[PDB]
Design a protein around this ligand. Structure first.
Ligand SMILES: [Ca+2]
Ligand SMILES: [Ca+2]
Ligand SMILES: [Ca+2]
Ligand SMILES: [Ca+2]
Ligand SMILES: [Ca+2]
Ligand SMILES: [Ca+2]
Length: 453
C-alpha cells in the first residue's frame, strides 16, 4: 500500500472529480458539460472584431411602457450599486471577450444593457433577459422596505452576486436547469460552489463556505460560469497576463481575489492569461488543501471547495497558511510553500521548489517522473528528523536499499550530503539500471530515516 500522506494527497486530488458517475443521484457534469448546459438557450450577443463591445446605462427614468411591467416605483441605481455593478461587469469582461462601457446605445456597439431598480415585490428579487429577447440587455433589481438585499451590494454578499448573476444572464447564461429544490437539478454540480447562476447552495454538494446566520457568496464568475461565458465569447487572455498573486498579498487588483485577514471568506475561480502566478493563502490559520491543477478545486481559508482554477489556466505557485495543509502542484515547475503547521506537499511533474516552512513537513512523490536527475525537485528547507520524503506511492512500501553506490539492483537508494554547501540529495534507481532515475535535492541534510518508502 501507500502511506496516509500519499493517500490524503491522492484523495484530495480526486475529491472534486467530475463526470461519468452519479452524485446525489444526478449525473456529475464536467466543466465543459456545464458550459453547454449554461448556454443551452443559444442566445448570445453577436459580433467582427472578435470582441463583443456592449454599452450600458443606469437608467435615470422609466422606459416607455414601464408602468405596464407591474414593477411599481422606478428608481435609479445609487452610486453604490453603480460601483458594484461595474465591478461585476468587470469580473465578466476579465474572463471573456466582452467589454462593457457606460454610455447610451451606440451604432458601433454590439448591444446595450440597462440597470434600474423597482419597488414592487411582485417583480421578484431581481431579473434579467437573455440577449435574444426583445428586452435584451435589461436587468432589474427590487428595492423596498421588505427587500433590502439590492440596496447595499458588496464583495461577498448576495447583493453583489445578484449583479453578477443577472449580468451573466444578460450575457446568455441560463440558470442550470428549468417548489423546486436542488432535487430538481439536472446535474450534480448545480450549486453556487460551481456557478453563481445556480439557485442552490454549496451545501447541496458538500462544500462549506459559512455557517447559519451568515451569508457568503462568490462575487465573481465561478468555475463553470467562466467556462460558459468563454464558450460564448472566447477567453480573454489579456487579463493579468503578467505575474499575479491571488489571495493574501494579492496583485490581482480585484476585491474578490484579495484576502487581508484570517477571517476572510474567499470564494473565487481564478482566471488568468499567463505569467508566473501564485495562490497565496499564507494568512490563514485553518487547514487548507490547495490544488494547482487546472480546473480543480481547493479548500481555502477554513472553508471547502471555495477556490478553483479555471480550465486553461496554469498556476505555478502556492503558499499555505499556518494550518496543516496539502499542496498539490501540476506539471509545471512549481514553488510550493507549506508555511507553519504540518504540511503534505506534492510537487507533481517538472522541477519543483518545495519549502516545508516550520513544522514537520512531508514531501510526497507519486511517480519517478516527478523528480528525475535532469529535472529534480529541491526542498529548500528540509529538516532532518522532522520532515519526510515519501516515496510510498512509488515503492508501494516495498522499502529501499540504502547504499553508498548503485549496485544495479532496483530499489537501491543513496542519501548524500555536501557539508560545504549544506546540500543534501536522495537518489534512487527504481528501475534497477545501475544509475539514479529519481533525484531530490535539499538544502539541509537528509537521513535515510527521513525517507518513507
Ligand atoms: Ca498572471
Ligand atoms: Ca501562470
Ligand atoms: Ca501550513
Ligand atoms: Ca510546514
Ligand atoms: Ca510540478
Ligand atoms: Ca516535481
Amino acid at each position: 500500500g501507500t502511506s496516509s500522506a500519499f493517500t490524503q494527497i491522492d484523495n484530495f486530488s480526486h475529491f472534486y472529480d467530475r463526470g461519468d458517475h452519479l452524485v446525489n443521484g444526478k449525473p456529475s457534469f464536467t466543466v465543459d458539460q456545464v458550459a453547454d448546459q449554461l448556454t443551452r438557450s443559444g442566445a448570445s450577443w453577436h459580433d467582427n472584431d472578435g470582441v463583443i463591445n456592449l454599452t450600458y446605462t443606469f437608467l435615470t427614468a422609466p422606459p416607455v411602457g414601464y408602468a405596464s411591467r407591474g414593477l411599481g416605483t422606478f428608481s435609479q441605481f445609487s452610486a453604490l450599486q453603480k460601483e458594484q455593478a461595474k465591478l461585476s461587469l468587470e469580473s465578466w469582461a476579465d474572463v471573456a471577450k466582452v467589454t462593457f462601457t457606460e454610455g447610451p446605445a451606440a451604432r458601433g456597439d454590439d448591444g446595450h444593457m440597462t440597470f434600474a431598480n423597482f419597488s414592487a415585490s411582485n417583480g421578484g428579487a431581481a431579473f434579467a433577459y437573455l440577449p435574444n429577447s426583445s428586452r435584451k440587455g435589461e436587468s432589474w433589481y427590487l428595492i423596498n422596505k421588505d427587500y433590502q438585499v439590492n440596496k447595499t451590494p458588496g464583495e461577498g454578499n448576495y447583493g453583489r452576486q445578484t449583479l453578477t448573476h443577472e449580468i451573466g444572464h444578460t450575457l446568455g447564461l441560463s440558470h442550470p436547469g428549468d417548489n423546486p429544490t436542488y432535487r430538481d437539478a439536472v446535474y450534480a454540480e448545480d450549486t453556487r460552489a460551481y456557478s453563481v447562476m445556480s439557485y442552490w447552495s454549496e451545501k447541496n454538494t458538500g462544500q462549506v463556505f459559512t455557517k447559519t446566520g451568515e451569508g457568503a457568496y462568490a462575487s465573481a464568475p465561478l468555475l463553470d460560469d467562466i467556462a460558459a461565458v468563454q464558450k460564448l465569447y472566447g477567453a480573454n487572455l489579456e487579463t493579468r497576463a503578467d505575474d499575479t498573486v491571488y489571495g493574501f498579498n494579492s496583485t490581482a487588483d480585484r476585491d474578490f481575489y484579495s484576502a487581508t485577514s484570517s477571517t476572510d471568506k474567499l470564494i473565487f475561480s481564478v482566471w488568468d492569461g499567463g505569467g508566473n502566478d501564485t495562490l497565496d493563502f499564507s494568512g490563514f490559520s485553518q487547514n487548507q488543501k490547495i490544488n494547482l491543477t487546472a480546473g480543480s478545486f481547493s479548500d481555502v481559508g477554513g472553508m471547502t471547495g471555495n477556490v478553483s482554477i479555471a480550465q486553461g489556466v496554469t498556476i505555478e505557485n502556492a503558499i499555505g497558511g499556518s494550518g496543516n495543509d496539502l499542496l498539490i502542484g501540476n506539471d509545471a515547475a512549481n514553488v510550493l510553500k507549506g508555511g507553519a503547521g504540518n504540511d503534505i506537499i506534492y510537487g507533481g511533474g517538472g522541477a519543483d521548489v518545495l519549502w516545508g516552512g516550520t513544522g514537520s513537513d512531508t514531501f510526497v512523490f507519486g511517480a519517478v517522473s516527478d523528480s528525475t536527475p535532469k529535472a529534480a525537485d529541491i526542498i529548500k528547507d528540509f529538516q532532518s528528523g522532522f520532515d519526510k520524503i515519501d516515496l510510498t506511492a512509488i515503492t508501494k512500501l516495498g522499502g529501499l536499499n540504502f547504499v553508498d553506490a548503485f549496485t544495479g539492483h532496483a530499489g537501491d537508494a543513496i542519501v548524500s550530503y555536501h557539508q560545504a554547501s549544506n546540500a543534501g540529495s536522495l537518489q534512487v534507481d527504481f528501475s534497477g539500471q545501475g544509475v539514479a532515475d529519481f533525484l531530490v535535492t535539499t538544502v539541509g541534510q537528509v537521513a535515510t530515516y527521513d525517507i518513507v518508502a
